[PDB]
């Protein structure tokens, strides 16, 4: 069991793939920064956080690539101790900065979709800049153990030198703490906050869709009433009209519920005349449902149509694509970080799994490095596709 090894293909596939990731990601992130700063100026909170995310990805692609040559030939590190520190702190820095910026992006989307008026505009841009400052400071301070403790280490008598984490205690709790904060504060709490924000967004999106869908049933049957004269089809049109009005009243406080109370009152009045064999009066009475639509329900319908239009924004699709891809690229790393942190504690004592975890950690860092390269490709949706004009120009 102690004798093993899978570096026959890792030492050749990763360096070329790492170089491809480096070039593609650096070009894409430079383009994203250039467009977000000039083609669509920083006039929104989302653009400020997305520019910061692109800058963090650029910093990761600029300070890690020494890992590409670190793994290109064995695990030798013929660089400076400072270079080892700044290349080993970059994984933690990028993880924390990107995850905090993504949580703030989700919070901003939640506020912009479900609290359109509770959040101001002048006081948010300054708040966004201050939050970005605090996020970068927090990411830098959470990468301080990898600066203090990471050091260059000559292996035995031979000249091979590695960038090793120096724990000045055999029974040291720093490896457990660093590997657990990377799992809890780096993954768990941000993931829970993002899930709550997106579920609350979906809850408001469902309520907005319910009001408009139920009003559509009210609208279609209203036209059916006017374009019909048999004293019977009017009844079925109002039957579907009454149920839609009752369902729409359940969306939502007193003014909204009151506004739908007269609406169902007019529907019943139309059914009273329809049941009496009168069509003109039934058709005439159904016309007042438009007058009460403007008085009470129109102001609530527009707030629902606007909310549904926010889902169709490019910035919403890009942010949720970035959030989803970040948690898919980093979940191999957090799973094996948790697997490794269990081995140190002695929770799992099995030689076979330990070799698997050791050979998987370099790949998990590789996958997380791939996330920075594929992030600017999500921006190629619409509106931001004007970068093609900039490239040709």
């Amino acid at each position: 069991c102690p004798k093993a090894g899978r570096h026959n293909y890792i030492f050749v596939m990763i360096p070329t793939l790492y170089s491809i990731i480096f070039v593609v990601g650096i070009f894409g992130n430079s383009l994203v920064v250039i467009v977000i700063y000039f083609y669509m100026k920083l006039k929104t909170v989302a653009s400020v956080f997305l520019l910061n995310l692109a800058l963090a990805d650029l910093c990761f692609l600029l300070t890690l690539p020494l890992w590409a040559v670190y793994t290109a030939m064995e695990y030798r590190w013929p660089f400076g101790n400072y270079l080892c520190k700044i290349a080993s702190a970059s994984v933690s820095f990028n993880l924390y900065a990107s995850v905090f910026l993504l949580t703030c992006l989700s919070i901003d989307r939640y506020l912009a979709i479900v609290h359109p008026m509770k959040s101001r505009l002048r006081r948010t841009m300054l708040v966004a800049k201050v939050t970005c400052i605090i996020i970068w400071l927090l990411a830098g301070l959470a990468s301080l153990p990898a600066i203090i403790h990471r050091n260059v280490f000559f292996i035995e008598n031979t000249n091979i030198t590695v960038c090793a984490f120096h724990y000045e205690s055999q029974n040291s709790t720093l490896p457990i703490g660093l590997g657990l904060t990377k799992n809890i504060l780096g993954f768990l709490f941000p993931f829970l906050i993002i899930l709550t924000s997106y579920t609350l967004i979906w809850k408001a999106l469902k309520k907005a869709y319910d009001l408009e869908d139920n009003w559509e049933t009210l609208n279609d049957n209203l036209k059916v009433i006017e374009k019909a004269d048999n004293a019977a089809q009017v009844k079925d049109a109002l039957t579907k009209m009454r149920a839609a009005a009752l369902d729409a009243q359940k969306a939502t406080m007193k003014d909204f519920r009151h506004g739908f109370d007269i609406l169902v009152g007019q529907i019943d009045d139309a059914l009273k005349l329809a049941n009496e064999g009168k069509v003109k009066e039934a058709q005439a009475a159904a016309e007042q449902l438009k007058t009460t639509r403007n008085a009470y329900i129109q102001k609530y319908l527009e707030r629902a149509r606007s909310t549904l239009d926010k889902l169709n924004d490019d910035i919403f699709k890009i942010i949720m694509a970035i959030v989803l891809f970040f948690f898919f690229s980093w979940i191999p790393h957090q799973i094996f970080t948790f697997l490794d942190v269990l081995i140190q504690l002695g929770i799992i004592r099995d030689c076979r799994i330990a070799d698997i975890v050791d050979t998987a950690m370099p790949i998990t860092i590789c996958i997380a490095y791939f996330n920075n390269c594929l992030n600017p490709l999500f921006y190629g949706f619409l509106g931001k596709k004007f970068k093609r004009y900039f490239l040709q120009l």
């Epitope: 039957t239 579907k240 009454r242 149920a243 839609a244 009752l246 369902d247 359940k250 109370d261 169902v264 009152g265 019943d268 059914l271 009273k272 049941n275």
Partner: antibody
Framework: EVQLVESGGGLVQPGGSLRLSCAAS????????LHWVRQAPGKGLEWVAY????????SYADSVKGRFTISADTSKNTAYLQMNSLRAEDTAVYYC?????????????????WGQGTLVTV | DIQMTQSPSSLSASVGDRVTITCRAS??????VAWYQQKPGKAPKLLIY???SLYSGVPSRFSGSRSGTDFTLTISSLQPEDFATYYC??????????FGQGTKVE
């Protein structure tokens, strides 16, 4: 307390006429819509008619229209159901229920209070 | 003419068991669905109104739920007094009242 009492049932020959009644107590008929729900022996409940002491919107079931005439007398706080041209399918127990008007929760409560029912056989 | 269909025409159950009765509507009737309980020789008693709201004076064992057009009545703790016929109702309008067929529980 709130209570609905039915009376006027009995046994008559097919094609005869009957005058069912639904007395009320503990509530007014002006603010409640009084219905008539019929349950055939061994069968389920089927709606028959309804009247309002309000403006006066009345209705009847499709299988009973033309031979039934529901009426309300707010002075006596009771509702009547005129029956004529009774067919063999009209043998059942007739329950009178109450149902509030649309504004508010009284409408959502459906037939909150029923009556003991009266038996009609033809 | 909205037709209400009740899935179990009968439902044998033991005391303390949990039973479920399901209703389906021809059209959408919103939550305008009430549940009744008729014992033999007696008038029905309203249990749940608005398809999810327990009526006053009714034990909390009874419950109702709505998922679009399907309405379900659920009792989690059956008692010896629960053996009766449970009817359905759609009350979207005064002249649009249609009941179910019955779910005699034994």
């Amino acid at each position: 307390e709130v209570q609905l009492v039915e009376s006027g049932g009995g046994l008559v020959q097919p094609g005869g006429s009957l005058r069912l009644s639904c007395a009320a107590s503990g509530f007014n008929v002006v603010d409640f819509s009084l219905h008539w729900v019929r349950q055939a022996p061994g069968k389920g409940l089927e709606w028959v008619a309804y009247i309002s002491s309000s403006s006066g919107s009345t209705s009847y079931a499709d299988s009973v229209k033309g031979r039934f005439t529901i009426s309300a007398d707010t002075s006596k706080n009771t509702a009547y159901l005129q029956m004529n041209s009774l067919r063999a399918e009209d043998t059942a127990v007739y329950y009178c229920a109450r149902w509030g008007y649309w504004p508010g929760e009284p409408w959502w409560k459906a037939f909150d209070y029923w009556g003991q029912g009266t038996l009609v056989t033809v | 003419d909205i037709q209400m269909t009740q899935s179990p025409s009968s439902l044998s159950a033991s005391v303390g068991d949990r039973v479920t009765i399901t209703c389906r509507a021809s059209q959408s009737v919103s939550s305008a669905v009430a549940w009744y309980q008729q014992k033999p020789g007696k008038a029905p008693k309203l249990l749940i109104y608005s398809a999810s709201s327990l009526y006053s004076g009714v034990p909390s064992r009874f419950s109702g739920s709505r998922s679009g057009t399907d309405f379900t009545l659920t009792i989690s703790s059956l008692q010896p007094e629960d053996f009766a016929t449970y009817y359905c109702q759609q009350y979207l309008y005064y002249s649009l009242v249609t009941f179910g067929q019955g779910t005699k529980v034994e």
